[PDB]
Symmetry: D3
Subunit: 154 residues, 6 copies
């Protein structure tokens, strides 16, 4: 588990509408993770259905896609050690009802269909989702000035 692991984090349209962009970004920023890509986007329905392709047969799929289209999305790539698993921990349980206070959903969300944000569930799915949402040149290369104080190793 190296310090250059990457995950895809998105602020869903409800998170944008409810003014949660700053506080969500600060949650990852304060943790020590590094933002290498970010853009506000309103992606087409095809991209969103590809993003959720493994859920294309679940009954909430059509409503989830329609809701993911209903507003802007803040799409992000965060880099850091174990950023995929720890990122999921920071977001909280997929259903906010099972989320703990102190996580994103435990502080801000209630309904699973309005759970404010998305986080890649695996290293492999993160690479696929990063490629789906970003062009390679949208990922910025830089090194944080506090790298050696966040990490004891590479």
């Amino acid at each position: 588990s190296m310090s250059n692991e990457q995950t895809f984090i998105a602020i869903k349209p409800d998170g944008v509408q409810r003014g949660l962009i700053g506080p969500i970004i600060s949650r990852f920023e304060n943790r020590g993770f590094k933002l290498v890509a970010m853009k506000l986007v309103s992606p087409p329905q095809s991209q969103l259905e590809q993003h959720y392709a493994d859920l294309s047969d679940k009954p909430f799929f059509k409503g989830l896609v329609s809701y993911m289209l209903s507003g802007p999305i803040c799409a992000m790539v965060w880099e850091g050690r174990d950023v995929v698993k720890t990122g999921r921990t920071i977001l909280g349980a997929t259903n906010p009802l099972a989320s703990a206070p102190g996580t994103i959903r435990g502080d801000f969300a209630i309904d699973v269909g309005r759970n404010v944000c998305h986080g890649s569930d695996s290293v492999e799915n993160a690479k696929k989702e990063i490629a789906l949402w970003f062009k390679p040149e949208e990922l910025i290369s830089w090194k944080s000035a506090t790298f050696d104080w966040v990490y004891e190793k590479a």
Copy 2:
């Protein structure tokens, strides 16, 4: 199911220590709707009725005395599963067993000074709301972000 209501009270120690704002913000930020609120020092008969289950406990008179020792911020919050999730936001009744990030896990130490109260069940909530609030004190309104907080109900 999103119109479930619960009774939340800031106890006198929470008022004395300046926790009214932070506690309200916990429920506001989560997405619940405030439908009734008032700062009160209720009569002792109301407090004894509120804690009627514990009237024979050894700490009952001391609990009633402390609940009379300062103002109380009484609130009704509305939202899906607000009773159970409201209890989770407050944290364990004994702060020593509470997790940081909850109200008691951030601000409280002693179980007799746990700064807040929350109804433990939908049925108990309906009693406590009727005990603490007149019907005309519950305000009916629709949040501008209701459809962004809830997908249904």
Copy 3:
């Protein structure tokens, strides 16, 4: 001398309630050292609102101002402290958020003068009038803060 039991009437207008600013606004007054002695969430009738703004009944914005004050709940409060009337106004910021300084309530949270989130009594005498208009006397709670002697050097 201006004593520590001066009182003012602070109200969170319907837009402040709708945008989730109840907690933040109360914290500004809590953190400053002022004491909350009365508070209730209320939906007052139009007559009460027109009385509250009686001195502006001839202003061109009065009709929409009253209607907007009826469009949602109001969090009505009485705060107690030394110079709480004037200092309360400073905390709220300029009536028009365009001319308010960041760090005040309006300088942090509002834009339009018709959506300036909050209200505060502009004088001691008008504070006493507004407190009686909005609250019954037995809704004002008498209590003493545990940190009174650390907020105040004198009565």
Copy 4:
């Protein structure tokens, strides 16, 4: 003053390096302004020289361009009534020494060459800077759920 006025706000590399992305966004989010475009970019030097074209003969021009190249930049377009003028007020004085606490520079910055952020200084400069930093399809059209609570008119 119409509510659809736009301004360009940028978080300079020192603001990104010092973990101020979340706090700065929240300042504009909490005030009621609308984010219509955002991206983390490492722009080419020609774009930076054009952005600061008025200062191309100043003695600190080359040092300014070099520091603007030293890290990622969070570029944003915010929309709201008088967002250009009020945005400069939210940022505080260009020299943080003359800035008041409660503004961004009054809370986070000290040196004028490290003042963490940029804001358009006029309506027409905003249009020029928006066109320079953003493709027109990067501005997202949407309506805030609390628009009628922030604004009394159009």
Copy 5:
């Protein structure tokens, strides 16, 4: 029991990353009383003496050199069960196992960069307090809200 004391230290990474304020506020808001604090760069022998129980395990020389790499904010906090609740506030020793809401759950990632230290037992706290502070550096005072934090001493 409300006079229990623990040793809390902000490690050089916490100082370097500008976390002194937030960490103090975490203990301050819980209701604990700060009775001693100083910014200090202790000698290597004191650091080796502090982690002497882990002297022959790995990561030892690296831990000492890192604890020497910057200033340390040493603190003594006082309150009921402050040793155990203090550790709960810090979060799990390895930040990857900590929960959001704790100090490490909000701010840290690597166990070798876990921002803070807290005594793990009442007896180890007394030793660390004696190791890090002279007796006259512990200040005696009573919080104005002591009776609103505690129901009993």
Copy 6:
């Protein structure tokens, strides 16, 4: 030069009693200044009377000294460019009734006799106050990881 300027900041007993230690430190931390010395201390009356020697003939002197004895004090030395003057601006006006919201006294204080904090009013007075409150070995020399992002030059 001037980036190593130092001032004396103290959190008075009322600031300690009201649980404001964390917030006050965060104001200076966030601004970019470097904490080089700090201790919780209960100084004797002679040190307090020497600190306020230039006020021994003001009528509020005796009450000021006895109140400065009534609880612990958090004494600090902060380092940064113009930290003396900018420190005063961060604290706010001496009388909190004249302080602007967003400063420390504008956010937390009311009475001038309970104005929470103290800051050196001049470079020359800071040096005398620093030597009065701290031994030279209590000042810790270190280099902030983000020094080059806070300052453009020494």
